Amino acid sequence: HGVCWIYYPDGGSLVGEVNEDGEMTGEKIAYVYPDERTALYGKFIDGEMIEGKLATLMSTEEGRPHFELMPGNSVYHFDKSTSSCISTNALLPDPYESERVYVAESLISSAGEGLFSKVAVGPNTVMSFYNGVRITHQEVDSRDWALNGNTLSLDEETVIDVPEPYNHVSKYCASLGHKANHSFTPNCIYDMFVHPRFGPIKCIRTLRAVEADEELTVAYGYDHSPPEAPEWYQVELKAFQATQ
Amino acid sequence: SKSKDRKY
Ligand SMILES: Nc1ncnc2c1ncn2[C@@H]1O[C@H](CSCC[C@H](N)C(=O)O)[C@@H](O)[C@H]1O
């Protein structure tokens, strides 16, 4: 008759009354984001989100979460990408990400758009998700760098990509992590994340406090001595090494 | 590899 909370290493969690087999199955299960406040509440089967409605975790009483549903009929479902499909709702934003980041012109010269904080946050804060289609390292490594601007290694078997035209916010805004530019003195890192809609992906997490309207940057981590990297990154590495 | 963040 109790409630259970199961946390992922990234700080998100599933919460609810488990069934006889210890599974997160029911009509009142929730995924709670790492702010411990934004939640997707509703029907889950063995921890997979079937219909999660946007909610706010208002309090816990005896361990039991007390949610308030947000207005608007915002509903989400598990929707892991494939090699060819990035999302079934490319234009439906992630509600936690939408409160934390926006896209605008980068402050880095000739670097296109960048990702910026909406609000002040502390260290270790998950800001944005890096979802994309899932393809192999062989495909990515055997094609030209001009097609590999948005490729992010997930693990030894899978690379996440945001190919054209999903690199434009008008065609894809379900996640925004591909909009963060590179720096050798970054304020964020790529980190593993298990997302209830996107499945196992990576996120952008701050390494230190960031101010409102500060540009979020991450180290892209190309191999400097296999560098195997785009020319703009090669140029910047030589500059970084000279400051050191 | 021609992707970000691989563990070398
Ligand atoms: N430090 C940097 N210097 C120059 N270009 C950068 C950079 N970091 C990222 N880029 C640019 O950003 C691309 C990766 S995706 C990052 C978001 C992109 N600026 C956009 O407008 O969609 C790279 O191919 C390069 O064009």
Nearest atom in ligand 1 to the alpha carbon of residue A113 is 21
> For ligand 1, which residues put their CB under 6 angstroms from it?
A 106, 108, 111-113, 149-150, 167, 178-179, 181-182, 232, 236
What is the C-alpha to C-alpha distance for residues A19 and A1, in angstroms, rounded to an integer?
Answer: 10
> Could you give the number of structural domains in chain A?
2
Q: Note whether A52 and A31 are within 8 A (CB).
A: yes
A73 and A90 fall within a common domain: no
Question: Across the interface, which of B5, B7, B8 has its CB nearest the CB of A152?
Answer: B5
Asked if residue A158 belongs to a domain, the reply is yes
CATH, residue A96: 2.170.270.10
What is the C-alpha to C-alpha distance for residues A161 and A151, in angstroms, rounded to an integer?
Answer: 4
Query: Looking at A78, A105, A135, which one is the last position of a domain?
Result: A78
Asked if residue A228 belongs to a domain, the reply is no
* 3-state class (DSSP) for residue A239: helix
Q: What resolution in Å is listed for this PDB structure?
A: 1.3
Can you give the length of chain A in residues?
Answer: 244
A209 and A95 fall within a common domain: yes
What is the C-alpha to C-alpha distance for residues A137 and A179, in angstroms, rounded to an integer?
Answer: 21
- For tokens 């804060």, the residue is A125
Asked if residue A1 belongs to a domain, the reply is yes
A147 and A166 fall within a common domain: yes
Distances (CA, A) of A213 to A108, A115, A210: 14, 9, 9
Asked if residue A240 belongs to a domain, the reply is no
A162: nearest CA partner in chain B: B3
Question: Does the annotation mark A178 as catalytic?
Answer: yes
Asked if residue A21 belongs to a domain, the reply is yes
- Taking the CB of residue A160, how many other CB atoms lie within 10 A of it? 27
Dmax over CA atoms of chain B, in Å, equals 13
CATH, residue A68: 2.20.110.10
C-alpha A111 – ligand 1 centre gap (Å): 5
Query: Looking at A43, A78, A113, which one is the last position of a domain?
Result: A78
DSSP alpha helix (H) spans, chain A: 95-98, 137-141, 231-243
* 3-state class (DSSP) for residue A142: coil
A52 and A91 fall within a common domain: no
Q: Note whether A77 and A50 are within 8 A (CB).
A: yes
Closest CA to A219 of A241, A243, A193, A187: A187
- Taking the CB of residue A74, how many other CB atoms lie within 10 A of it? 15
Pocket test for ligand 1, best of A232, A236, A237 (most atoms within 8 A of CB): A232
What is the C-alpha to C-alpha distance for residues A34 and A44, in angstroms, rounded to an integer?
Answer: 19
A18 and A125 fall within a common domain: no
Please give the structure tokens belonging to residue A50: 């079937």
Asked if residue A71 belongs to a domain, the reply is yes
A117 and A71 fall within a common domain: no
A53 and A96 fall within a common domain: no
> A152 vs B2: CB contact, 8 Å cut-off?
no
Can you give the length of chain B in residues?
Answer: 8
A103 and A116 fall within a common domain: yes
Closest CA to A233 of A186, A181, A178, A168: A181
Annotated catalytic residue within A41, A96, A172, A178:
A178
Query: Looking at A78, A101, A131, which one is the last position of a domain?
Result: A78
